A paper describes a structure:
The anomalous peaks overlay with the previously modelled zinc ions. In the data set collected below the absorption edge, the theoretical zinc f′′ decreases to the level of sulfur (f′′ = 0.4 and 0.5 e− for sulfur and zinc, respectively), and both anomalous scatterers are visible in the anomalous difference Fourier maps. For each zinc-binding site, the anomalous peak heights decrease threefold between the data sets collected above and below the Zn K edge, confirming the presence of zinc. To illustrate the procedure, f′′ was refined with phenix.refine for the three collected LMO4 data sets. These data sets were initially collected to perform a three-wavelength multiple anomalous dispersion (MAD) experiment at peak (λ = 1.2853 Å), inflection (λ = 1.2874 Å) and remote (λ = 1.3051 Å) wavelengths. As the data sets were collected near the Zn K edge, significant variations in f′′ were observed over a short wavelength range. Nevertheless, the f′′ refinement successfully identified these variations, yielding values closely matching the measured values and confirming the validity of this approach.
Author numbering: 19 to 147, 297 to 329, 336 to 339
The structure:
């Protein structure tokens, strides 16, 4: 006899169905609590936390480590790429030379003195007489960084040949 869907309570007569969180589901019934996406089609896993079943992006958004821009002071979502320097994070558009206002990009040479950024061609000689050191702009990284998989629950797609992997 058919399995019951944990999402709707109904028997699952569909040819293809999902297994996740120890339960069977109609694919349409396994949805992100926040954005309603159909988890089994958009990706390979779900996240469980605080009564919710979430897609990866909303899990990051609601529970990942957000930060704040050292230049403008405003929060940075976990999902946003940031520039890094001397232990600070910056909005990409905030990562600019304090003298000429050029936006600094990966591979650029730059100087840092007491929070102020300077491009290679605006070396602040007057200030320098630790800022003498030339640094290389790194690639942008995600604000949230790496996170553990302890709330991740893989989704398995199954075929009922009326149960086999898909
Ligand atoms: Zn259902
Ligand atoms: Zn979502
Ligand atoms: Zn900023
Ligand atoms: Zn400059």
């Amino acid at each position: 006899s058919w399995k019951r869907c944990a999402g709707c309570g109904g028997k699952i007569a569909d040819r293809f169905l999902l297994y996740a969180m120890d339960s069977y589901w109609h694919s349409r019934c396994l949805k992100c609590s926040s954005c309603q996406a159909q988890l089994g089609d958009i990706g390979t896993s779900s996240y469980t936390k605080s009564g919710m079943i979430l897609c990866r992006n909303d899990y990051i958004r609601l529970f990942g480590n957000s930060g704040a821009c050292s230049a403008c002071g405003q929060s940075i979502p976990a999902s946003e790429l940031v520039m890094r320097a001397q232990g600070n994070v910056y909005h990409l558009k905030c990562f600019t030379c304090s003298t000429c206002r050029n936006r600094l990009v990966p591979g650029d040479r730059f100087h840092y003195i007491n929070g102020s950024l300077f491009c290679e061609h605006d070396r602040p000689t007057a200030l320098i007489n630790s800022g003498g050191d030339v640094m290389v702009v790194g690639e942008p990284t995600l604000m949230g960084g790496e996170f553990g998989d302890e709330d991740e629950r893989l989704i398995t797609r199954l075929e009922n040949t009326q149960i086999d992997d898909e």
